[PDB]
Design an enzyme around this catalytic site. Structure first.
Site, short mmCIF file in Angstrom:
data_model
loop_
_atom_site.label_atom_id
_atom_site.label_comp_id
_atom_site.label_asym_id
_atom_site.label_seq_id
_atom_site.Cartn_x
_atom_site.Cartn_y
_atom_site.Cartn_z
N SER A 186 -10.13 -0.04 0.19
CA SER A 186 -10.95 -1.43 0.52
C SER A 186 -12.37 -1.24 0.45
O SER A 186 -12.74 -1.42 -0.78
CB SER A 186 -10.40 -1.43 2.27
OG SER A 186 -11.30 -2.66 2.75
N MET A 187 -12.97 -1.41 1.47
CA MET A 187 -14.53 -1.12 1.34
C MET A 187 -14.84 -0.10 0.84
O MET A 187 -16.11 0.26 -0.01
CB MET A 187 -15.36 -1.37 2.81
CG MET A 187 -16.72 -1.80 2.73
SD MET A 187 -17.32 -1.63 4.46
CE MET A 187 -16.67 -0.34 5.01
N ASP B 10 -1.29 -8.67 -0.70
CA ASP B 10 -2.63 -8.21 -0.02
C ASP B 10 -3.23 -9.67 0.11
O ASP B 10 -3.70 -10.45 -0.56
CB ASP B 10 -3.47 -7.62 -1.23
CG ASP B 10 -4.43 -6.53 -0.20
OD1 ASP B 10 -5.21 -7.21 0.64
OD2 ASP B 10 -4.86 -5.58 -0.58
N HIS C 118 -2.28 -5.28 2.61
CA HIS C 118 -3.63 -4.76 2.62
C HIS C 118 -3.72 -3.25 3.09
O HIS C 118 -4.11 -2.34 2.16
CB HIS C 118 -4.87 -5.71 3.22
CG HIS C 118 -6.16 -4.90 2.96
ND1 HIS C 118 -7.16 -5.23 3.87
CD2 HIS C 118 -6.87 -4.01 1.76
CE1 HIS C 118 -8.34 -4.56 3.04
NE2 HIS C 118 -8.15 -3.91 1.87
N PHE D 228 -12.96 -0.67 5.70
CA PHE D 228 -13.33 -1.55 6.87
C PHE D 228 -11.82 -2.06 7.61
O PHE D 228 -10.90 -2.39 6.90
CB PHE D 228 -14.07 -2.80 6.54
CG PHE D 228 -14.47 -3.64 7.78
CD1 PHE D 228 -13.76 -4.51 8.15
CD2 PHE D 228 -15.66 -3.49 8.33
CE1 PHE D 228 -14.01 -5.39 9.24
CE2 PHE D 228 -16.00 -4.12 9.47
CZ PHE D 228 -15.19 -5.19 10.07
#
Lengths: 438, 438, 438, 438
Positions: free
Chosen positions: B98-99, B228, B257, B32
């Site tokens: 990430s997602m 992060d 991130h 995302f």
């Protein structure tokens, strides 16, 4: 292999023939009483020189049919015509021997020289054998020829051993120029001929060819043995030379009638020299024609002049190295990649010297033709037709019905050694390829 | 390029994807709120190493359709399945970010690892983000995630600039690791996503994956940035490593991130090293499989031992000269001409060093196949099918329905550079050629 | 709107294109790193002039797919070929810009000019950018371009802002010739391109087109800005002009690389003028060819001289009324009814001024062609076949396998509904009809 | 009798052959420089034994055509292939002599052994005649063979008498083993061959067959004379025996090269014994393989023991009556109706003695297979494919993709009208039928 040239009752008059090699077609016509196999020493020498040897057996002799009709030179030439027409020869060479020399003369004086490039007369019958009041330059009266006919009908087989004794001059050349085994085969061949043919053949020897001599408009070669017993040189070649002075005259010293075997080395030297002269005039005008189509792809500039010289220096036969040529061809700024491949492909077919080395890559990528599956498929359809083709004019016409990409790819198949068509057909593809790119 | 994975009313749920390169299939699942194009630095590195990069856009993001239903990991894994099944990947690698890491985890615990060779978790969500009474090791309470959803629904576009400020750590890395231009593109991607997707996506972050972790039986890689901000390392990767100790654990120092762009050099090195280890076990078992089929043409003897050594010394990557190999392969007494070509064809595909030189001739003459127009024609029909093929097992099965002469000729087409298929498909021809000669 | 032109693994290589307006097809090929939409200023002017604008996005740019293979001009031209072949364009104009000039050149030199009427090179790459020892007229060594490649792979997004500063010369033209908004959009387009495309594209700039230049046989237009920073005028257009002197040469003073937007008024004026000039040349070259065939059916007399003057006064553009002409044509004593029809058919196709009035009846009765059921049936079979043909020489060839009466009847079909076929194709019938009556 | 196998220019390459007798096809390949008629002593013995003798003349020898191209073992095997394919021989025997042994070796190593049951090498060329540094086991250097070639072109006819002097050892066997009449004919045969063939044939003698030897997977027979002058026994058969120890090795004492006539009694005895032994071994190897599969359907008990003896008493060749067998098969307690039909089907194919019974009914009712319309339809699709099949392994593999009921119905098709298909293919169904019920 047979060629129908006539018809006798329920049977068909067929002639046995052979077609070997590629290049200038040379038709070899044998004499009495042998077959086409009697040219076996001349055929081998002509095939090494790069010619196309075509021999056939006369009606009533060899492996050919044995009719009982049509034993005159008007028919023999007619038979010769049918053979030339069926194979469809252009600028071919007619070489005759003994009785065979008569067929060549009657054909040229009756059917023209549209298909003939040069002629050669080995142990000729010309101009006349029959000794009459009109021509004292004859070899014998009618009583002599009639004696031979009666001798054959008496015992055709026994006549041969005595005939071949004067045919090869065995009292001089046996065990020397000609073995005893070679004489045996010549006997076997004569015995396997037509019985009626051997009795009718001598009646054709005393045919008048005097009206046919000045009709020779092609380069000619008059050759004869000096020790010829069957056909006296003074009654044949000596008076033939006077009727056709423009013909190259060659006497083989101490040579018998059958000098095709005894004096093969002597005959072949004079024959190869004659062909190399008369055909060279024709050989070069087709090479410049290839040069014409190839230069039609090169853009006008300084290179079109240099590329022309690299071709001409090769076409003549001057020694050249491929490494310099292929590299200079590779590092060329103006020449497109497609035409580089075609030039390299020509350079490979024109030089006898492969150096026993590798293949080139810049040409392989050009002759690929975008590697399209459907375009490449049309290239193998061409390869099947080019393998069956023989002539230069035949190869050009076939490969002119295909796309330009297909021709390039087809040139690629033969270059990458995935095929093997003849040299005459190879040029047929290039010239067809270059005509489409216009 | 799209893959239908679902259905919503009158419209069809399609996902945009890309399929590049050849080799071990590596599926890259983004996070995302970016798209598949965010792997462009990892894609380039994977393509140079010789892998096959496959990236796709999640429903509601990037160039994919934007539905308003089915926003959960059970659906996300379901979408991934349809993609893997449609593309028919075998022994592939799932890499998440990430997602995206949740989908890899969610896929493995439901569909097994029959198609999966290894997995990689970059900036993972595992094991749990929701801080409850059952897990104090969470990253945030439910009130935090609900604040994000409300922030997005307020102004989804404005939310991004603030989100990307902590995504790449712009207060630390801007102008250094990542330019403002690269951020702008990242903004454009997020704005071109689904409005409903960006509001429903955060509700999937606090999904429990604890029951999915121990079902991982393939070599795994847990990687995470220390700086992060979006995903605190102590609440994610640290406790994730404890749940799966067998996974290779790698921390990138001072990485935000969005470490896919900022610390690409660091990521690419660690990812390629991880891939080089887990995939190497499979890489060698296919090479020996080719060796297996190739050795089935060599007659049993001392050479079969030497040829095996010549194959193994090349498959490993030890320097070898082709000139010695091609000559020693040429001057072999026991080997038939046909098998000489096949060995030479393999030897040419296994060494990167062509030396920028010529081609060989002994193989060209072997791969000719008697130059039959019909046998060579069956070779180009195969070449059209081999250009469209991708896998090793796929290439072998197709080229096993054709005759042996066609296979030889087809190997010739690619060797004489009249075509260009992949190395995996190239071996498919060889392995098919060797199976038919038995 | 998309056109499939290739195939990459599981995905298909599709190209985005647009087709607007009706008339003479003008293909506009954009450059790096924009899309087809960068022609929006040239497109509007061409649509107002009455042309048919056809623009497409190069692979890896704009809305087209983003493959990782096939980044060379042989492929770019192949894509161009596929577009031109698929759309079935007739008498079109290829206009290139930046990289687009290379696609035009590679196409003309590989696929010919069967579909091409004229070409145009805006800010060309020709003839060579790589400065070597063989060509000192280069702009830079390979080390410069390699620096660009390394710069793109570093940060493709950041590279754009710096590139566009010299593309439009923002330090000179920003806020004047080009707004900040227009620059922003151009960035988005570049950012929406292939990550792999932008890293592979610069390696195609230094491609040699010197071998492609002399294959240009159609009217050309070389245009370039003097203040071009990306492509130095002295290393491009100046030496390009020497290679093709026959091409109309036009320099825009103080114009940057992206002169498509900044100096649009100047370019559009020069481009529309060139087409209006170059197509007028072909319009007129078919009319005098028609006059040759049309006068070849008229019997020698005072009228054959008078008809020629009435034709020349129309072909030139002198004002004439159809009512006087059609009536005077009716009351003609020597002309047969059939030839009256041919003159009337030409008169309807050659004058733009119909006055918005009726059709004539004496010609419809003339174009019947004896009303033979078998001849009229071959005319409707013909009308369907003339629509698939494209060239004038092409139109002539189809209508040459039919009877003269069928052609007359076929001319009636075209007389009732034109058209369908086009005037260039229409004349192919007339010239074929008059050719058959000989 | 002729078989077209090639094409040369205008002529077609045809080969003379003879086809005599009925039974197991035995192909006799003659050597240099004789024809197929030189097998006349071996032919008579093979016809009395009950074999099918097939002899053909090699291109350029005997009554076959005499081309000047394609004189290599790759072509010679291709010609042999064309002969075998046209005549469609199955499980045939290849017997070679002199040059003929090379054709046998090259065919097996290029075209496989799908049609071959056994091979025999009389006075072989294997493995190598050319004595080099790589192979000291040669008989002579290339300078020796080149002397022979020059000798043939000198006087091909005289060369024969000297060649046959060492071929039959006339200084040892004349008037003893071979008459003077027989020598004359052998000369005639050689003289009736191609002039170019006899000069090109010796250049094929020093061909390397070392790569062809290990491809022999069928029972072989290496035979050679001890007094062979043309082919020294120590340079041929001795090192050949080491390369193929499994081959039966037989030396004939005091036998010349042409031991086909001189030592006819010894050769004929040893050859018939080898065939009677080697074919008996495979005939029986299919019977025990069938017996293996057939007993795999019978439940263990006293009948499984009884059925095996009734089979063995048939497999050995002991006389047995079918009426008792077919009745005893009917009145069987343990056996199911289905298995009764299969046993009856085997019993009909295994006994030469049919006892004069039209056919049985209990099996026809058993082989119905429930009479399903869809099942009988799947039986005729198989029946068409089994007629095109030749081998046992080929028949089994095809008939393994069908249901057990389909095989039974397919066995019914073969049971009523056999056959069509052949016994080797017939057993392939049976072995497949019993295998499917497991």
């Amino acid at each position: 292999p047979f060629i129908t040239v006539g018809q006798e009752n329920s049977t068909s008059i067929d002639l046995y023939y052979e077609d070997h090699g590629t290049g200038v077609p040379v038709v070899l016509i044998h004499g009495f009483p042998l077959s086409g196999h009697s040219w076996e020493r001349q055929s081998a020498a002509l095939l090494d020189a790069g010619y196309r040897v075509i021999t056939y057996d006369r009606r009533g002799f060899g492996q050919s049919s044995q009719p009982t009709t049509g034993y005159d030179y008007d028919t023999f030439a007619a038979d010769l015509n049918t053979v030339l027409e069926t194979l469809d020869l252009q600028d071919a060479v007619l070489v005759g021997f003994s009785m065979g020399t008569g067929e060549v003369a009657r054909y040229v004086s009756s059917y023209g020289t549209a298909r003939i490039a040069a002629v050669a007369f080995l142990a000729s019958l010309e101009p006349f054998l029959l000794k009459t009041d009109d021509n004292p330059d004859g070899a014998a009266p009618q009583e002599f020829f009639d004696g031979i006919v009666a001798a054959v009908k008496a015992d055709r087989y026994a006549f041969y051993t005595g005939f071949f004794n004067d045919f090869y001059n065995l009292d001089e050349n046996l065990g020397t120029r000609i073995s005893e085994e070679a004489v045996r085969n010549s006997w076997n061949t004569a015995a396997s001929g037509g019985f009626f043919a051997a009795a009718a053949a001598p009646t054709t020897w005393y045919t008048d060819f005097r009206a046919d001599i000045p009709r020779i408009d092609v380069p000619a070669l008059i050759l004869h043995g000096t020790g010829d017993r069957t056909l006296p040189i003074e009654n044949t070649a000596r008076v033939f030379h006077k009727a056709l002075p423009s013909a190259e005259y060659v006497e083989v010293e101490g040579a018998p009638h059958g000098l095709l075997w005894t004096h093969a080395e002597e005959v072949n030297t004079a024959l190869l020299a004659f062909l190399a002269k008369a055909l060279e005039a024709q050989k070069q005008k087709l090479l410049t024609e290839v040069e014409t189509y190839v230069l039609s792809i090169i853009p006008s500039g300084p290179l079109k002049a240099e590329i022309a010289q690299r071709l001409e220096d090769v076409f003549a036969g001057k020694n050249t190295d491929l490494e310099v040529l292929m590299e200079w061809l590779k590092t060329r700024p103006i020449l497109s990649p497609l035409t580089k491949g075609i030039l390299g492909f020509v350079f490979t077919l024109t030089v006898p010297s492969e150096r026993g080395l590798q293949r080139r890559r810049f040409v392989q990528n050009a002759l690929n033709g975008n590697g399209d599956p459907n375009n490449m498929d049309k290239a193998v359809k061409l390869y099947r037709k080019l393998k069956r083709e023989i002539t230069f004019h035949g190869a050009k016409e076939i490969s002119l019905s295909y796309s330009a990409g297909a021709l390039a790819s087809c040139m690629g198949l033969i270059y990458n050694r995935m095929g093997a068509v003849t040299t005459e057909v190879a040029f047929g593809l290039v010239c067809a390829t270059c005509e489409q790119i216009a």
